[PDB]
Design a protein around this ligand. Sequence first.
Ligand SMILES: Nc1ncnc2c1c(I)cn2[C@@H]1O[C@H](CSCC[C@H](N)C(=O)O)[C@@H](O)[C@H]1O
Length: 279
Amino acid sequence: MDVVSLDKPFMYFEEIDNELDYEPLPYQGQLKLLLGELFFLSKLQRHGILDGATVVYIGSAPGTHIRYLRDHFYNLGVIIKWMLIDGRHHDPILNGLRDVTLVTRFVDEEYLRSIKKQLHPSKIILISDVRSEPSTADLLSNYALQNVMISILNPVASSLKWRCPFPDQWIKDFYIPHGNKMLQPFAPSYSAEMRLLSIYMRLTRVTKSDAVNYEKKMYYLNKIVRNKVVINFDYPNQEYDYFHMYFMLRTVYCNKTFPTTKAKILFLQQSIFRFLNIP
Ligand SMILES: Nc1ncnc2c1c(I)cn2[C@@H]1O[C@H](CSCC[C@H](N)C(=O)O)[C@@H](O)[C@H]1O
């Protein structure tokens, strides 16, 4: 790989500072979700709004990584209830947890109102990973449903699956919430997916020119940036994705104390990799 010297990685989409013309690990998907959700929920913990909340995770199955998320905050003493809702069955590793409610159901507008009624007036934190390759109509239907989740559940914060439809497959302008577009390390090599993180809802219009901007910015990120070795980085692995993961994991809280920040991140990465069975 090519070498580079960086003070920090790109954390949000807006920070990508170049574009490029697009051209055609074990269980890496669970690692991608676990890191982004650790990042999101740790930010909410820093703002002091996580304690006492109920996390409503829609599109959670199988959700093997969710067991690590729940165990992490449970051992920190943070009082969290989990509600995992998906039409498919969840990973059996999520069984036998009193603070984790497993729901086998595809959500619609009617069911969203019923769960809001039963959880009201407790704080709701929404995590959505719903999907269906998907067509642009599928994405528009998925993103419409995510808007319905927010307008009905009225969460204090939300993390939404966000991949803009490709410009050559455009159908119609649509609206998404305002928020920060978190970038995902260990995503597929040329994925353009991000997580929309919002702390509360004003809607924002997405156009075909935005789709072009997304496509070129994310290709430059995947083709150029993520194939760099950060030579100044003090870490056993200097590849950019590990550099990126390192900066996400340093916002994570820990019960154990460490002599250095590097020792803390190294412990966290080892803990995550072992649970996900990554060498
Ligand atoms: N309306 C809905 N209500 C409920 N779940 C819905 C929908 C719709 I539309 C789609 N999904 C679900 O989203 C998942 C996408 S991959 C998750 C991956 C998961 N986050 C993991 O950790 O492995 C599938 O499991 C699918 O069943």
